[PDB]
Amino acid sequence: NHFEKIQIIPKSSWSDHEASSGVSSACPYLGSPSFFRNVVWLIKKNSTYPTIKKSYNNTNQEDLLVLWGIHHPNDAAEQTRLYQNPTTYISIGTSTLNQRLVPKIATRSKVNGQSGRMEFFWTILKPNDAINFESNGNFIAPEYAYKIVKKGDSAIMKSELEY
Amino acid sequence: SYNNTNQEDLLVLWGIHHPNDAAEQTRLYQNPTTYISIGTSTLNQRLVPKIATRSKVNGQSGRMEFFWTILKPNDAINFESNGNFIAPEYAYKIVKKGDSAIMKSELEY
Numbered sequence: 001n002h003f004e005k006i007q008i009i010p011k012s013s014w015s016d017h018e019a020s021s022g023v024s025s026a027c028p029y030l031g032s033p034s035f036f037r038n039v040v041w042l043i044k045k046n047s048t049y050p051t052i053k054k055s056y057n058n059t060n061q062e063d064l065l066v067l068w069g070i071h072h073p074n075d076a077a078e079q080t081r082l083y084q085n086p087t088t089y090i091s092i093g094t095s096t097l098n099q100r101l102v103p104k105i106a107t108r109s110k111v112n113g114q115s116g117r118m119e120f121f122w123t124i125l126k127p128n129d130a131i132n133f134e135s136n137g138n139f140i141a142p143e144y145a146y147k148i149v150k151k152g153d154s155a156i157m158k159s160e161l162e163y
Numbered sequence: 164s165y166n167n168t169n170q171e172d173l174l175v176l177w178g179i180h181h182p183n184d185a186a187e188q189t190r191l192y193q194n195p196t197t198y199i200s201i202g203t204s205t206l207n208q209r210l211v212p213k214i215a216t217r218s219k220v221n222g223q224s225g226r227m228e229f230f231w232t233i234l235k236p237n238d239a240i241n242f243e244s245n246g247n248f249i250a251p252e253y254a255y256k257i258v259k260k261g262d263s264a265i266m267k268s269e270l271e272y
């Protein structure tokens with residue numbers, strides 16, 4: 001019933017990577033290219049992408065809903081243009097999670113004029129636990145997360161009416 | 164490889180070990196990229212270890228993931244690998260089916 005959006009990893013913490021140019025034409029805000037608000041699209045900076053070894057220790061008294069993703073280009077040319085490392089991965093680990101993603105480069109139809117595909121994953125960190133990301137490319141890193149401050153009894157209603 | 168020679172089925176357990184850094188890989192396995200290929204009359208399974216940094220549970224960060232299968236009579240299983248192999252040392256013959264259940268209870272006998 002209640003989410004508390006907190007900044008686990010600040011966009012001001014990405015200095016060895018370009019963390020302000022990861023916009024797209026497919027999500028226009030005020031008719032200008034932009035991107036999701038709660039996740040950051042890391043790209044190469046000065047044609048170099050040293051591995052991200054990031055980590056976060058869930059210090060609150062509750063659980064945390066952490067979102068991240070992976071970007072699949074449509075050809076190795078876009079890989080090099082977006083990431084110097086030509087074969088990449090994202091390794092995520094917690095007290096339970098164990099997940100090593102690899103991007104699937106393929107040719108495919110254009111949706112919203114964009115062929116590349118972003119696939120987002122999610123998990124819930126328990127109190128007093130930690131999450132560990134590592135990667136060398138294609139990392140749609142989290143910029144925000146959600147504290148689960150109030151459980152309850154609820155539902156999701158597929159309806160069209162107004163309030 | 165093992166040829167299931169009994170007249171019944173067999174419950175075979177194995178696993179794979181995921182270290183937490185390539186240093187532990189080399190310390191535990193000279194081969195830096197490994198795999199486990201398992202095959203039967205039905206199974207076809209090629210595992211690769213996922214090296215990642217993660218929390219310590221019981222002070223141990225590495226994670227073991229165990230798989231299971233059931234060999235039919237007169238059939239065979241074939242393991243191949245070059246690292247991270249938690250090999251089976253024992254298996255279970257299924258000698259008596261029946262009607263049973265699993266009860267989540269706390270009482271004593």
Ligand SMILES: *[C@@H]1O[C@H](CO)[C@@H](O)[C@H](O)[C@H]1NC(C)=O
Nearest residue numbers: 057058128129130217218219
């Ligand atoms: C998170 O920090 C606490 C210190 O308050 C520590 O005890 C705990 O071990 C840390 N998490 C992990 C997974 O080590």
Ligand SMILES: *[C@@H]1O[C@H](CO)[C@@H](O)[C@H](O)[C@H]1NC(C)=O
Nearest residue numbers: 166167168204237238239240
């Ligand atoms: C297992 O051994 C029997 C011999 O008793 C043989 O006929 C059978 O083909 C073997 N299993 C396989 C998968 O070849």
